Ligand binder design. Structure first.
Ligand code: SF4
Length: 493
RNA sequence: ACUUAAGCAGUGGAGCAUGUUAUUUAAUUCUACCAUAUUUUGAAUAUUAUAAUAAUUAUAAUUAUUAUAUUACAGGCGUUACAUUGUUAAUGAUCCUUAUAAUAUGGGUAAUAGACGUGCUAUAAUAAAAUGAUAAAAAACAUUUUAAAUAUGAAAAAAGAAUUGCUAGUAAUACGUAAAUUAGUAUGUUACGGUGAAUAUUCUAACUGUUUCGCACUAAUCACUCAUCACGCGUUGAAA
RNA sequence: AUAUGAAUUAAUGCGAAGUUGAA
């Protein structure tokens, strides 16, 4: 626990090692797995892992009870850390006082997972009115969710579908903005819109995803459709955005403008040219409990599939929105803020409003050498930035930057604040796609003359009938002519 | 059909070794890190000048060299969320230039509540110790002694989860030899030979692919369909 | 009887996101 500076404290993110409640670990390893002989649980967990090892895949509901317990094993470990960190980010950014939500909803394939994390977070003295929690996967998951929640302090209401006769002030989503690899662009909009309807005034939505390029794509698309950066050009900073309804981003994003890292299609992470592309992931460390230690052992699961750790480094992407309060106050407040005080063109190097909301976020592990720390930042201006701190520019700023880590908000000035030039090829890619759209319309027009001259050549020497073109090849042209015709037909659809 | 049950061979609580994590720290780097002093064209190339040296022209002019200044800069174990080549360091781009460069001293990389992996040695008598034939790229044989926390071990005894392999020149060997990294270090890896067993498979079995049936499922059983509970809007039917 | 209106009243159609059963 370092002195650093008071501002550096608010800037820093929760870096402590993660741990499950010992009661919960004892409960799981005593009941949920002791009856099961470990081999079958390991087999079903391995099955679950193998079908996500595929590039840019998505997680799936747990079909059968053995897969149910295997999901309790493998993914509770990861999702608990993800939610715990994201909720800590939320609590700290909004302040510890504003976060006393009464109406609580959690959606995810796992057990009541946001519920347990929230309980552990704000402590065992917390007894709201409502603690609804839907479990998508299986009925057998709810009894084990009850088992887990019993050891903590039940009022949690285990459902199977979203109750839609009530609004909520706190909502958590885990792996819910998509369910199919295909249909990716649009299911995110449908799913998010489904939940934004049931977010009460002043509430918060906390979305957590896998943290691989597909997941980053999901968060980026959700942010784009919700904020709509293009609808408010030249508007820097964070003012709530429409979607009598208004929403703003709490974290990780430090700007409401477009995401600099967004490339539209996940599949292009799979190409040779996409071998250096980068995405807004976020790592954390959590120490393995007994069962994982007992579980992740054997040739099947504890070897190179072809030394051990006490902990897992989990990747996840996440997003948060804060909702404004329905009132004669907030609406006019937002309207006037958008009218009379634009926050100007925040320059590269700027710190935004110089409050925790608009601080640059450290989106890569800072690289540290003698005297100087360099940082890769998503800036409140919104461009990728390399900021270098030195012993020269100061001693204290160097001290703080030299303890800086990924996922922290850096909150000071630097001697150089240049653009993050490297792997900004997403901006080069934004050119390529727009090239295609304009030149796509040349493609059909080229294809017209390409096929016309081919057939005009055909008819000349087939009307003249010298038949220099072979019977095999001539009938090949006719195949191309009609085949090209049909392919144009369906492309209209 | 792994695996299990059996039989056999074992290993598994102790320590260290070797790492990792955490916590701690001014650092506990990823000599490269911390504290205190201390150097600013520095390491090179060029410019432009005053000093000597030469060569010329004519003391001066020029050219060099050599110093001293001279600033472009040099320098950077800075960057790959800095690229392209090259390979399995370079160019470029950018960043620092009383500092991110340079030197010195000391300190750290070895801190220790914990936690986990990898191996070696132990815990005695179908087995250790002392003494006396054979390889490829010494165990063996012989004799004797041998306590009961020792004369074992260089805490460790009793019981457990776990786990490794199962006819084979395989396992195991308190059997050794050798190579590379190396100025020096191996309990790590690699090969390389010598000796050469035990023991038998009722059983269970996920996963598992074929499959058979039905389907009203087609995002595929969390599938779809049906009924309930509420809100409004209609349509028609009787009517004192 | 052929119509036209009616307090009172029967059934059913639709749709909004859902709520409840497991036919
Ligand atoms: S790069 Fe910045 S804007 Fe994009 S998702 Fe990450 S934090 Fe948000």
């Amino acid at each position: 626990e370092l002195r650093l500076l008071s501002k550096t404290l608010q800037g820093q993110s929760y870096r402590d090692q993660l741990e499950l409640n010992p009661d919960v670990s004892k409960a799981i390893n005593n009941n949920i797995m002791a009856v099961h002989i470990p081999n079958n649980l390991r087999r079903v967990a391995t099955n679950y892992y193998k079908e996500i090892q595929e590039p840019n895949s998505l997680h799936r509901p747990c079909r059968t009870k053995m897969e149910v317990d295997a999901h309790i094993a493998s993914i509770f470990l990861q999702n608990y850390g993800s939610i715990f960190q994201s909720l800590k980010e939320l609590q700290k950014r909004v302040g510890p006082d504003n976060f006393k939500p009464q109406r609580i909803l959690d959606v995810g394939y796992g057990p009541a997972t946001g519920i347990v994390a929230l309980n552990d977070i704000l402590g065992p003295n917390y007894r709201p009115d409502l603690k609804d929690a839907v479990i998508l996967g299986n009925a057998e998951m709810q009894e084990r969710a009850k088992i887990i929640l019993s050891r903590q302090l039940i009022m949690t209401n285990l459902r199977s579908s979203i109750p839609a006769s009530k609004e909520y002030d706190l909502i958590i989503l885990t792996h819910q903005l998509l369910h199919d690899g295909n249909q990716f662009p649009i299911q995110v909009d449908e799913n998010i819109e489904h939940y934004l309807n049931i977010l009460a005034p002043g509430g918060h939505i906390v979305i957590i995803e896998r943290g691989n390029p597909m997941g980053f794509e999901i968060i980026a698309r959700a942010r784009q459709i919700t904020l709509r950066p293009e609808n408010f050009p030249d508007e820097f900073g964070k003012i709530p955005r429409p979607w009598n309804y208004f929403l703003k981003v709490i974290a990780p994003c430090p700007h409401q403008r477009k995401c600099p890292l967004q490339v539209g299609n996940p599949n292009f992470y799979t190409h040779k040219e996409g071998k250096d592309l980068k995405f807004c992931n976020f790592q954390k460390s959590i120490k393995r409990p007994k069962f994982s230690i007992e579980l992740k052992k054997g040739k099947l699961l504890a070897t190179s599939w072809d030394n051990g750790r006490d902990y897992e480094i989990l990747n996840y992407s996440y997003l948060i929105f804060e909702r404004s309060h329905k009132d004669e106050n907030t609406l006019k407040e937002i309207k006037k803020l958008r009218n009379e005080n634009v926050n100007g063109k925040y320059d590269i190097g700027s710190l935004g409003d110089d409050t925790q909301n608009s601080w640059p976020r450290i989106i890569n592990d800072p690289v540290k050498r003698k005297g100087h720390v360099m940082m890769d930042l998503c800036a409140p201006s919104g461009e990728l930035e390399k900021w270098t701190v030195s012993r020269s520019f100061s001693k204290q700023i160097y001290h703080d930057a030299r303890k800086s880590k990924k996922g922290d908000l850096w909150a000071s000035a630097a001697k150089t604040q240049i653009k993050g030039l490297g792997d900004l090829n997403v901006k080069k890619f934004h050119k390529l796609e727009k090239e295609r759209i304009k030149q796509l319309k040349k493609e059909e027009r080229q294809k017209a003359r390409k096929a016309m001259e081919s057939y005009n050549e055909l008819e000349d020497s087939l009307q003249f009938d010298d038949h220099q073109f072979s019977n095999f090849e001539v009938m090949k042209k006719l195949s191309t002519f009609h085949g090209n015709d049909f392919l144009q037909h369906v492309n209209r659809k």
